[PDB]
Structure formats: structure tokens, C-alpha cells
Amino acid sequence: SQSQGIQQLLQAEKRAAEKVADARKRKARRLKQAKEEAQMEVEQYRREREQEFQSKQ
Amino acid sequence: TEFWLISAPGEKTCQQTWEKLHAATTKNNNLAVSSKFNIPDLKVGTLDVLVGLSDELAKLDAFVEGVVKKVAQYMADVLEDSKDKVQENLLASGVDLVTYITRFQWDMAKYPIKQSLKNISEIIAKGVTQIDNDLKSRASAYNNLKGNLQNLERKNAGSLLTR
Amino acid sequence: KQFGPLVRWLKVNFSEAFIAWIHIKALRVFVESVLRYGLPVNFQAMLLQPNKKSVKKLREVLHELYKHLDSSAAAIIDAPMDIPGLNLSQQEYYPYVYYKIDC
Amino acid sequence: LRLGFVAGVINRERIPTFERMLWRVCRGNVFLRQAEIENPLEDPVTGDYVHKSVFIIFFQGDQLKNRVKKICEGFRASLYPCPETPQERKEMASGVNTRIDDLQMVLNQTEDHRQRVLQAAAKNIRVWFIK
Amino acid sequence: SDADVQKQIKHMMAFIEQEANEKAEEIDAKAEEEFNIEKGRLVQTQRLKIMEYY
Numbered sequence: 432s433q434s435q436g437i438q439q440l441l442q443a444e445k446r447a448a449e450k451v452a453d454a455r456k457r458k459a460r461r462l463k464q465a466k467e468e469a470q471m472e473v474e475q476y477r478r479e480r481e482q483e484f485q486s487k488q
Numbered sequence: 489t490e491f492w493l494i495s496a497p498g499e500k501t502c503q504q505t506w507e508k509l510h511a512a513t514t515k516n517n518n519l520a521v522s523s524k525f526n527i528p529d530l531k532v533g534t535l536d537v538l539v540g541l542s543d544e545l546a547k548l549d550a551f552v553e554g555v556v557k558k559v560a561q562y563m564a565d566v567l568e569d570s571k572d573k574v575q576e577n578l579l580a581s582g583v584d585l586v587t588y589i590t591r592f593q594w595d596m597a598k599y600p601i602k603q604s605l606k607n608i609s610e611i612i613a614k615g616v617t618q619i620d621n622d623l624k625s626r627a628s629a630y631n632n633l634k635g636n637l638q639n640l641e642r643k644n645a646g647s648l649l650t651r
Numbered sequence: 652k653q654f655g656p657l658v659r660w661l662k663v664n665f666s667e668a669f670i671a672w673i674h675i676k677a678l679r680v681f682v683e684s685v686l687r688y689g690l691p692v693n694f695q696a697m698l699l700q701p702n703k704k705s706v707k708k709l710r711e712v713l714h715e716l717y718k719h720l721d722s723s724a725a726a727i728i729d730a731p732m733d734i735p736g737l738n739l740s741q742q743e744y745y746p747y748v749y750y751k752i753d754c
Numbered sequence: 755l756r757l758g759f760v761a762g763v764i765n766r767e768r769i770p771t772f773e774r775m776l777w778r779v780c781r782g783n784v785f786l787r788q789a790e791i792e793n794p795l796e797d798p799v800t801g802d803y804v805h806k807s808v809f810i811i812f813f814q815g816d817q818l819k820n821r822v823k824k825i826c827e828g829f830r831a832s833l834y835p836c837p838e839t840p841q842e843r844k845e846m847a848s849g850v851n852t853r854i855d856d857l858q859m860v861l862n863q864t865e866d867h868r869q870r871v872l873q874a875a876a877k878n879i880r881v882w883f884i885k
Numbered sequence: 886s887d888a889d890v891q892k893q894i895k896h897m898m899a900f901i902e903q904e905a906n907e908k909a910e911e912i913d914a915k916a917e918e919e920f921n922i923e924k925g926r927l928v929q930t931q932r933l934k935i936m937e938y939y
Contacts, residue, residue, distance in 0.1 A: 432887060433787060436894040437812065443898040444757050447905035454909030458916035465920040469927035476932060480939050491700050493676065494713070495684040495748035498693035499720060506695045513712070519705035525696035527681050532692065534907065535783060535900040536815030538682055543738045545679040550741075552672045559665045566658055578662070580669035585754055590698065592673055599674070609678060616671045619664055630657045687782050689896025690903060722889035725777035733779055735828030737820040744778045756901065782893055783900070814897060 491589065493525060528594040530605055541605060548609065555620050562627035676750055684748045687721065710745075717746035758813040762826065762833035763791070766805045772829055776811065779825055780818050786811045 499505040510522040532538065563578050564571045571577065575585050582588035594601065598615075599608045644651065684694045701709055726744050733739050742749075764772060769788045776784055791806035809831070813822050826833065837843040875882075 433785075433890060436891045437785070440757065440812070440894055440898060443901055444755075447756055447901050450902075450905040450909050451912075454912040457909075457913050458919070461913075461916045461920050462923060465923040466927060469924045470931070472928060473931040473935070477935050480935060484939055489700075489754050491698060491752040491754050493680045493750045493752065494697040494699060495680065495688065496695050496697040497684065497688045497720060497748075498695055500693075502695045505720075506697065509697050509713075516712070517708065518702065519709040519712075520699040520701045523698045525677075525698045527677065527684075527692075527694045527696045529692070530678075530681060532685055532690070534815075534904045535686075535897070536817045538686055539780070539783065539815060539817040541678075541682050542686060545675065545682055546738065546741055548675050549672075549679055552668075552675050556665070556668050556672050559661065559668050563658070563661045563665065566654075566661060578665050580666045586700075589673065589752065589754055592677075594674070594677065595670065598667075598670070605678065605682070609675075612671050612674055612678075615667060619668050619671075623664065626657060626660060630653060633653055689782065689893075690899045722886065722893070724886055724889060726774045726781070728774065729771070730775045730778050731771065731829075733775065733825060733828070736779070736822075736824035737817070740779065744781075783897055785890070785893065785897075814901060 492520075496525075523590050526593065528601055530601060530608065531603075533604060533606070537606070541609075544609065548613065552616050555616050555623075558620070558623055562623060566627065566630055673752070676752060680748065680750050683750075687748050713747055714745055721746035756814075758815070758819055759810075759836070760813075760823065760826075760833055761808065761810045761836050762831050763806050764788075764809050764829070764831045766807060768829065769807060769809065772809075772826075772831070775825060775829070776822065779821050780813070784811060784813045784818055784822055 494509070496505050496509055499508075506524060510524075514520070514522060560574070560578055564574065567577060579585060580588060582591075599611050642650070680696060681694065684696070685692055688694070699709075723746060727746070730744075773786060773788075776786060787810040789808050791808065794803040794805050796803050811822055811826070813819055823833070835846070837846045
């Protein structure tokens with residue numbers, strides 16, 4: 432019936448809303464991971480050149 | 489002459505629609521010769537985008553119809569003395585226009601399939617619009633050459649008042 | 652000096668011009684077909700050369716045959732002009748998606 | 755918040771032609787409903803009573819909307835505003851109930867006021883004329 | 886028919902759902918290049934600061 436089908440459509444759009452929300456969540460998580468991973472590699476480099484600086488000393 | 493493209497939406501597997509439209513239909517009555525067009529797998533976008541395209545491609549067809557008619561008209565206006573068997577002089581490809589169209593397939597070399605339809609149409613439009621401009625330049629140039637020659641003919645024409 | 656080269660250039664021009672026109676015709680056919688017959692895409696399109704005096708019976712049978720492929724509880728029979736809005740229709744409605752080439 | 759939704763009113767015997775128009779212009783991608791109005795109602799511009807119907811249209815994008823709504827206007831269908839949720843339906847229903855009740859009250863009152871003032875003038879107008 | 890009407894509805898549900906699929910997928914793919922660009926940005930900037938001080 433038309434009413435039931437269209438209500439099922441409202442459900443379909445709520446599904447679409449869920450999908451887009453999932454996309455945004457993935458993006459935020461991935462961006463945060465990028466930030467942290469870059470910071471950690473930076474820490475590795477910082478310590479490495481600290482060590483080389485002390486060796487030259 | 490005239491040809492038609494029809495969707496033939498498979499009805500599940502290909503044969504069930506395609507052969508029902510070709511063999512069953514022509515066996516019932518040979519009202520038309522039938523062949524396979526084999527639409528490519530162009531990447532489908534959003535519904536809103538495709539609805540907009542439903543008008544985009546209407547306008548594009550209405551424009552390129554005039555473009556190709558212009559090409560034919562200028563071909564005839566330059567080769568008037570040998571315009572006979574028109575489509576043979578004009579032929580785009582193949583031995584004959586019917587042979588080309590009955591074997592038409594999407595050209596990956598000009599526009600590869602992987603792109604979006606918006607991009608593919610945009611590059612098509614670039615091609616055809618540059619073609620239109622180059623027609624308006626070069627065929628007009630040859631017409632101007634004919635005009636110069638005809639003005640020389642006018643110089644030759646008439647009594648010595650003109651000559 | 653110029654007779655030959657512009658005739659040949661027009662030949663070359665028409666090659667790509669016509670090929671692009673058929674590209675466009677295919678694009679229109681495909682888009683309308685997807686919009687009509689929802690996802691997935693199942694369009695193994697047909698090319699017809701109508702034979703002499705065949706149009707009437709041919710379209711009659713084809714239109715009748717497409718009524719159980721496309722729903723016929725709407726449209727089809729008649730409609731007013733559609734000037735208001737984004738676009739006004741360029742074509743009739745058939746339960747088959749159709750376009751034409753003037754070869 | 756990605757489905758397009760509208761509702762309005764349209765006359766009888768216009769409904770199937772309207773459906774055909776919509777399903778021909780936005781084929782296989784828009785939908786509509788129709789239902790009666792009890793008793794005929796007055797037309798605003800023409801000024802005569804006629805039977806009416808509620809209708810709904812559902813659409814999926816603005817490219818479709820720019821066909822559908824302007825086609826409704828071409829059919830001279832009337833939409834007016836509509837609620838977003840059932841709570842907004844309650845809000846709008848209470849608002850329109852109150853406002854149409856107020857308009858009916860002041861309409862009766864103003865027509866009776868016209869009667870009153872017109873009789874006040876008519877009580878002596880003939881003497882006004884001759885004077 | 887109501888059967889064809891609900892088939893139409895199923896179709897447009899499929900359309901909107903695949904549209905959401907494409908939107909989410911492209912947002913995630915762009916999140917990949919944001920991942921890349923942020924990695925480059927932060928590594929480069931902190932690298933430059935450390936390099937200057939050292």
C-alpha cells in the first residue's frame with residue numbers, strides 16, 4: 432500500500448542519514464589518526480637528531 | 489532515412505528481451521531490421537544529477553544536430569559541382585554511413601569510459617563546439633574566396649562600362 | 652590552391668562531428684533508460700531500421716509489448732503542455748525508451 | 755532531511771491528468787496521493803464553489819522540484835505551507851484552526867457591520883438624495 | 886497497480902541509498918587525501934622547527 436511504502440521510504444532516508452553520519456565519523460577518526468601518527472613520527476625524528484647532536488658534542 | 493534506438497532493458501538476462509525484440513518480432517512481422525547496440529557501462533551518478541542530465545543531453549542533441557547539419561551544408565556548398573551521392577562524399581567513417589552506424593561502439597580513444605558522464609559530455613561539447621567555430625571560420629573563408637572569384641567574374645561581366 | 656584542402660578538412664571535420672553526435676544520442680538514450688528502469692542498469696539497446704510503411708503497426712506492437720515492462724497506471728494516454736518549469740518535453744511518452752537518428 | 759515533500763489542493767477530474775503530467779515529466783522518480791474534500795469549497799479568484807481534493811507529491815531532488823512545483827503552478831494547483839514533522843502538524847493545525855476561526859468571526863462581524871452601516875445610511879438616504 | 890507503485894518506491898529507495906553510498910564513499914576517499922595532506926603538513930612543520938633549533 433502507498434502509505435506503508437512511503438513510510439518505508441522515510442525509513443530509507445533515515446538509512447541514508449545513518450550512512451552519511453558514518454562517513455563523517457570515519458573522516459573525523461581518520462583525520463585524528465593522521466594527526467597523532469604524524470606527531471609520533473616527529474617524535475622519532477626529534478629524538479634521533481637529539482642523539483646525533485649529543486654524539487657530535 | 490531514419491533509424492531508432494530502443495532501450496531493450498534485458499528483462500533479466502539479455503537474450504530474453506533482445507532476442508524477443510529482434511527474432512520473435514521480425515518473425516511475427518519484418519516491420520524493421522534489428523541489431524544490437526550494446527550500451528556501455530558509463531558510471532551512473534546521483535538521481536538529481538541524472539535528472540539534470542535529462543535536460544543537458546536534450547539541449548546537447550538539439551545543438552549538435554544543427555552542428556552536423558552545418559557541416560553537411562558547407563560540404564555541399566563547397567563541393568556543389570560534385571555533391572552527388574551526398575553521404576558518400578560526406579561519409580564520417582567506413583564504406584557507408586549505414587555500415588558505420590550498425591556497428592557503432594563507444595570510442596574509448598576519444599573519451600575513455602572510466603570518467604563520469606558529466607566529464608564525458610563536457611569533452612564531447614568541447615570537441616563539437618570547437619568544430620562549430622572552425623566551421624564558421626574556414627568554410628566562411630572558402631565562401632569568401634568564392635566571393636572574390638565571383639567579383640572578378642563581375643569585373644569580366646557586362647559591357648566595357650563594367651569591363 | 653584552396654579547393655582541395657577545405658573539402659578534405661570538411662571531410663575530416665564531419666568524421667568527428669558525426670561520431671560525437673552519435674555519442675550524444677547514446678548518452679541521452681542511456682540516461683533516460685536508467686531513470687525509467689531503476690537501478691541496476693539492464694539496457695542491451697536495440698537499433699531498428701524501420702521498413703517501408705511499417706511505422707504504424709511497428710509502434711503499435713512495440714508499445715503494447717512494453718506495457719508489462721513499464722507500469723501503465725500513469726502517463727501514456729494524454730497530458731497537457733508542460734511549458735512551466737525547467738524544461739518542456741521534446742518527445743512523446745512510450746513505455747519503451749526511444750530516440751531517433753536521421754542517417 | 756533529504757526527501758522533498760509538499761501538499762496542496764486540486765479540483766476533481768484534474769487529478770488523473772495531473773498524475774499523468776507528473777509521471778511523464780519526472781518519470782519513475784516522483785509520487786503523489788489524492789483524496790476528497792467533503793462538500794464543495796469556494797474558489798478564491800473565480801468566486802464560485804466546486805468540489806476539491808487534497809494531494810501530496812514526493813520528490814528526491816531540486817532538479818525534480820524545479821519541474822514538479824512549477825508544473826503544479828501551471829496546473830494552477832495551490833500548495834500553501836506544510837509541516838515538517840507530526841509535532842509541526844499539530845502546531846500548524848492549531849494555528850490554522852485558531853486563525854480561520856478568528857477570520858470567520860471577523861468576517862461575520864464585518865458583514866453584519868456592512869449591513870448595519872448600510873441600513874443606517876438608507877434610513878435617510880432618499881432625503882439625502884433630494885436634499 | 887499498487888505493486889508497480891511499490892516497485893517504483895523500491896527503485897527510488899535504491900537510488901537514494903546508492904547516492905548515500907557514493908557520497909559516503911567519496912567523503913571517505915577525500916578523507917584519505919586529507920590524511921595524506923595532514924601527515925605532510927604536520928611532519929613538515931615540526932620537522933622545520935626541529936631543524937632550525939638544532
